[PDB]
């Protein structure tokens, strides 16, 4: 699918596109128009993605999808330049399936036909522990691997449970270059490499995996006859972004009437605790995991308070939180679950940010509690904005943290609701911004 | 016992670009927000903008983007920068520090006058 | 855009009485973000009120803010002689924007 590259850079994206695999009524197909077949094998799942649902892998014969290149689409061929991406989920991999499956490398997508004895040539995404491999493999044996050696501290790593956008661009004259959310993370030349003779068939599927539980979900794979070059990244990266959802920690869809462990994004290393029922909340910081031998270190998640979302006005509609909702937001504390709000008049800072409090019930006393989840700044982090509004929908603010002192308790991060944010949301860094965290299978503490 | 100087030339000529400096004593940069103002004489108060040891900045919407303010924690110093200025950029300025968590200013320098004229 | 219209232009006062200097905002200001500066010749601002009631750190009781929606208003209970000077009231709800002032000055 030839261009000019001169073009306007949407068109670039779009007519360069010779793979484009969508779920649409939970059936994979390709959209790119070339229109090679897709076959879904039995236990191939589809999960939550990004936009819709996504393909989700696990480790056994029957959950592969494979695409049959159409008759004949040429991608690589000889040295013609050509990239791929993908959303990409792994779990955390556990101390333990690390020190024992460390050095076993598997593909998850792969155009080299694999025999019993060997492997052939073509392309492949492998993971070997906390590894991201791409290998280049011509006719003629000679190989090219990058290596992406994803960080140690899992809360911010890229193969650590979270939807990531990776991209990979070969230029058969200079480099490979790997791409995770638009940001360069690993390179490797190929000057050297001949011609890559791949199967004409494309097999999503986790291959020579010896971890029985281990799993990936892939969403929106897509091949691109070019060498994208950083801008053309970055504006297909975006283009896969918007607000429409909001998202949990994880990538996926927010949801009502699920619990969530609520971490502050500019405070990552703190819990949300509770000082008492009908009183206030304030941050601590969270226990942590560090294990040097095995590369990795992490602070512990699902610690602190719990918090439930509920629609306001219950409407019936499904369980998605949808950008601009109105909710009320609980906490959920010895085995109840407890309204958060500020009471009118209620205890407030000089500066008037607002002390929320948690089950608050004196009677006779307006509690305002009407929130609105919205999505305002921050578009590649998956984080959410919560606003809070009086009786006459006059904003108290958006859900923030003062540092400050009630009576003779210690200094503290506490939280309140404060207008002062709307006059800062192009800042780099906030204490508005919220990252909903749900228990998970991809994490287990160690 | 935080004090704010401002520096920056007396005279500039007319489509120059005006440069101004603040420097912190008695404190740091650290996680404040720290405002630029203007007084033209005898015309009352204007808020230019403010910076962030973070690189944030903001500014006055009416203003027409001809400010950039900029920041340097080591040297405990805020700047200013105006482009193509104009005899009406004539004012005396005020560097402050906002409050923690408002947008008003509650610690000032004395100003610097700038004139502008061939 | 907000813009705050301030009256009276001039207040002409002795000291001992008391000082009701009024803001009027173009828009209801619904988060009370307004504040009050003084200003005497020759010197910097000073941070009086914000939050429309709030006094700032050291600053005298004598000061006072009140008001919501477009109207707002600093009080002070007693003129002092040091209290003769420019005040001005600041909008910081949306951007920041300050009215044209008023003077407080002896009468005689």
């Known amino acids: 699918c030839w261009v000019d590259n001169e073009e306007d850079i949407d068109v670039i994206l779009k007519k360069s596109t010779i793979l484009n695999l969508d779920i649409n009524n939970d059936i994979i197909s390709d959209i790119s128009g070339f229109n090679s077949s897709v076959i879904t094998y039995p236990d191939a799942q589809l999960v939550p993605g990004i936009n819709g649902k996504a393909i989700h892998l696990v480790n056994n014969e029957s959950s592969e999808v494979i695409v049959h290149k159409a008759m004949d689409i040429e991608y690589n061929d000889m040295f013609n330049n050509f990239t791929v991406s993908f959303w990409l989920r792994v779990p955390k991999v556990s101390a333990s399936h690390l020190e024992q499956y460390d050095t076993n490398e598997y593909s998850i997508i792969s155009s080299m036909k694999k025999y019993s004895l060997s492997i052939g040539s073509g392309w492949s995404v492998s993971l070997k522990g906390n590894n991201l491999i791409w290998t280049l493999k011509d006719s003629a044996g000679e190989v090219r691997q990058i290596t992406f050696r994803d960080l140690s501290d899992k809360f911010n790593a890229y193969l650590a449970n979270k939807w990531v956008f990776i991209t990979i661009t070969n230029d058969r004259l200079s480099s490979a270059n790997l791409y995770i959310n638009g940001v360069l993370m690993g390179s490797a030349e190929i000057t050297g490499l001949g011609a890559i003779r791949e199967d004409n068939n494309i097999t999503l599927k986790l291959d020579r995996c010896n971890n029985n539980n281990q799993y990936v979900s892939i969403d929106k794979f897509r091949i691109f006859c070019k060498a994208l070059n950083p801008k053309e990244i970055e504006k297909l990266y975006t283009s896969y972004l918007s607000i429409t959802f909001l998202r949990d920690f994880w990538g996926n869809p927010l949801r009502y009437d699920t619990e969530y462990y609520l971490i502050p994004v500019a405070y990552s290393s703190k819990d949300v605790q509770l000082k008492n029922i009908t009183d206030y909340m304030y941050l601590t910081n969270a226990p942590s995991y560090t294990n040097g031998k095995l590369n990795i270190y992490y602070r512990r998640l699902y610690s602190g308070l719990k918090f439930i979302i509920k629609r306001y006005t219950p409407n019936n509609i499904d369980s998605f939180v949808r950008s601009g909702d109105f909710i009320k937001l609980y906490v959920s504390y010895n085995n109840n679950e407890h309204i958060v709000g500020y009471p009118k008049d209620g205890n407030a800072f000089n500066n008037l940010d607002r002390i929320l409090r948690v089950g608050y019930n004196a009677p006779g006393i307006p509690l305002y509690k009407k929130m609105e989840a919205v999505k305002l700044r921050d578009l590649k982090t998956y984080s959410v904005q919560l606003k809070l509004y009086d009786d006459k929908d006059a904003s108290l603010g958006l859900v923030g943290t003062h540092n400050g002192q009630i009576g003779n308790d210690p200094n503290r991060d506490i939280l309140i609701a404060s207008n002062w944010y709307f006059n800062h949301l192009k800042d780099k860094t906030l204490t508005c911004d919220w990252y909903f965290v749900p228990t998970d299978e991809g994490w287990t503490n160690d | 016992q935080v004090q704010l100087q401002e520096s920056g030339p007396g005279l500039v000529k007319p489509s120059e670009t005006l440069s101004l400096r603040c420097t912190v004593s008695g404190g740091s940069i650290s996680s404040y927000y720290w405002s630029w103002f203007r007084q033209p004489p005898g015309k009352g108060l204007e808020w230019i903008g403010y910076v962030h040891y973070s690189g944030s900045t903001n500014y006055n919407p009416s203003l027409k983007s001809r400010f950039t303010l900029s920041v340097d924690t080591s040297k405990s110093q805020f700047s200013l920068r105006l482009r193509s200025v104009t005899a009406a950029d004539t004012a005396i300025y005020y560097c402050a520090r906002d409050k923690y968590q408002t947008d008003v200013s509650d610690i000032w320098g004395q100003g610097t006058v700038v004139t502008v004229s061939s | 855009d907000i813009q705050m219209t301030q009256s009276p232009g001039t207040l002409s006062l002795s000291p001992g009485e008391r000082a009701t200097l009024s803001c009027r905002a173009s828009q209801s200001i619904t988060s009370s973000f307004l504040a009050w500066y003084q200003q005497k010749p020759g010197q910097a601002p000073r941070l009086l009120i914000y939050?429309?009631?709030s006094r700032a750190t050291g600053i005298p009781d004598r000061f006072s803010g009140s008001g919501s929606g477009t109207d707002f208003i600093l009080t002070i209970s007693r003129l002092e002689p040091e209290d003769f000077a420019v005040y001005y009231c600041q909008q910081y709800d949306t951007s920041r924007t300050f009215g044209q002032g008023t003077t407080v000055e002896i009468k005689r």
């Open positions: 939050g429309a009631s």
